[PDB]
Amino acid sequence: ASGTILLDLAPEDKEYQSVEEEMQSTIREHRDGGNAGGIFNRYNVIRIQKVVNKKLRERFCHRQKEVSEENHNHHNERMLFHGSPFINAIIHKGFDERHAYIMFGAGIYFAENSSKSNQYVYGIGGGTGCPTHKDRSCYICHRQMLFCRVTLGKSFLQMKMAHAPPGHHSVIGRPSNGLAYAEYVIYRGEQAYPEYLITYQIMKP
Ligand SMILES: O=C(Nc1cccc2cccnc12)c1ccc(N2C(=O)[C@@H]3[C@H](C2=O)[C@H]2C=C[C@@H]3C2)cc1
Ligand SMILES: [Zn+2]
Structure with missing residues (x-):
């Protein structure tokens, strides 16, 4: 079963604000003229929740620990965006490479620009x-x-x-x-x- 708990962030929360700031400020214009992700300069954020899952957290911490000692104690952590039709599954079971399908490889894809991940929300190429x-x-x-x-x-x-x-x-x-x-x-x-x-x-421009 899932040990996942969703915690709701109040909009007045600073953490709520940092996340939306990151999401808004990393919007970019893409080569497809907004074909895949849509046309917009801004999002309207309805909700931001913290995913709490202990076993998942430990699996992350254990691997990060291993990567660290493999890489001179640098795990090189980055906050990155993900988009795909499988969000609900992921917050419950975690990212699974066995669920990677055919892009530029059979892996799990992340973007520093939220608008790039937004292109995958409704599938490959939108x-x-x-x-x-x-x-x-x-x-x-x-x-x-x-x-x-x-x-x-x-x-x-x-x-x-x-x-x-x-x-x-x-x-x-x-x-x-x-x-x-x-x-x-x-x-x-x-x-x-x-x-x-x-x-x-x-949001419509
Ligand atoms: O972890 C993933 N999926 C899942 C995790 C746990 C349980 C699942 C149950 C059903 C389906 N997916 C699950 C997952 C892995 C890889 C992708 N993924 C990408 O990140 C790239 C490709 C892909 O399949 C696709 C093209 C670019 C993006 C979207 C999406 C979701
Ligand atoms: Zn619609």
């Missing part, structure tokens, strides 16, 4: 948007994403692979041409904790 209106840019329907602690360890900089390279703990596609914004990939579910569940809407 699917066909919200269920009701089939609108990738719907300003009505509610969306969710995650703000996660991720153990990057020693990252590899690069197209499709199964695991991190020898001596590494994560793969990062850095902008170059090539990518517009960084993508962070891990191939072990316990190297990310789904810290905050964010429920939101995109």
Whole structure:
């Protein structure tokens, strides 16, 4: 069963404010002209909850400990965004690499820009948007994403692979041409904790 408890953050909470700040301030314009994630300069944040799960926390702490001693006591933790159709499963069971499907590999994908993760909320390339209106840019329907602690360890900089390279703990596609914004990939579910569940809407400009 799940040992997951959702704690509601009051909007007047400072923690609530730091999270939304991170989410708002990392919005970027993407190459697709808003095709996948929609068109917006801002979110409307409805809810932000802390995911509390003890066994999950320990699995994260145990792995981070291992990565640390593998990487000169640097676990290289970053707060990163995740988007996918499987948020509800993740807050209950945790990220699972066995659930990774076919992108740029068979791993778990994170973005430093919330708007990039927002592109995955309704599927790869935004699917066909919200269920009701089939609108990738719907300003009505509610969306969710995650703000996660991720153990990057020693990252590899690069197209499709199964695991991190020898001596590494994560793969990062850095902008170059090539990518517009960084993508962070891990191939072990316990190297990310789904810290905050964010429920939101995109706002019409
Ligand atoms: O941990 C994941 N899913 C799940 C965890 C635990 C229980 C589950 C039960 C059912 C389904 N998924 C579960 C999960 C793993 C990888 C992805 N994932 C990505 O992060 C990349 C790809 C993917 O499948 C897809 C293309 C880019 C993004 C979205 C999504 C969810
Ligand atoms: Zn809709």
